[PDB]
Amino acid sequence: FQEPPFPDLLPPPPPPPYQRPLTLVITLEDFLVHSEWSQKHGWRTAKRPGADYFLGYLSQYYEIVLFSSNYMMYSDKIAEKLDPIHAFVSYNLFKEHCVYKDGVHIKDLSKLNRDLSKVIIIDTDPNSYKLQPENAIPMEPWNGEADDKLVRLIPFLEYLATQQTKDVRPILNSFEDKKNLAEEFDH
Ligand SMILES: [Mg+2]
């Protein structure tokens, strides 16, 4: 284990040519997986349609940080079905790494030791990015039904990485509602 200082959560990015143009921070529950209890089956957990492709494909443009909103043991339990694909994640973070202020657990992007102009967070609770909403792409919580909402995020995210932009924050502010970002991306 080689890791961060003072008291930044991530070690420094590798130098070019290995550095990715951008850092993508994503949450775990109600985004990649969904867990539920029924009488017929146990506690079962499901992986979203396209999760494997999503992580594998975007890893070529992004340093992918899986920042769970859950404590680590619970996170590990419901993330089990992500095992064969999990190696494409660069770093793992958990609720233990959030900051507590105003009765809210916040993923404070400034503690990531990353240039904030080069960082995107996708999450299902706006409080998780309460300190840096200008970096955020909101998603409504996944309830377990098959969809392709995940994969449809890719063309815009792929666009950002292959377009030399020196800041990602003014571009997200150029949408007048980020909840329809994927299709608003259609001219
Ligand atoms: Mg799948």
The CA 33 to ligand 1 mean position distance, Å, reads 10
CA 183/CA 13 separation, integer angstroms: 32
Report CA-CA distances (Å) from 183 to 25, 81, 145, 147, 179: 21, 29, 20, 15, 10
Do the Cβ atoms of 105 and 131 come closer than 8 Å?
A: no
Q: Which of 36, 56, 32 lies closest to 44 in space, CA to CA?
A: 36
The Å distance, Cα 47 to ligand 1 centre, comes to 6
**Residue length, the chain?**
187
Å from CA of 123 to ligand 1 middle:
19
Domains of the chain, each with CATH number or no CATH:
1-187 (3.40.50.1000)
What is the 110 CA–ligand 1 centroid distance (Å)?
32
Distance CA 92, CA 120 (A): 16
Compute the distance from residue 13 Cα to the ligand 1 centre, in Å: 29
Angstrom distances, CA of residue 13 to CA of 54, 64, 65, 114, 169? 22, 12, 12, 8, 20
Q: How many CA atoms lie within 13 A of 104 on its CB side?
A: 11
What is the distance between the alpha carbons of residues 87 and 55, in angstroms, rounded to a whole number? 9
d(CA 85, ligand 1 centre) in Å: 10
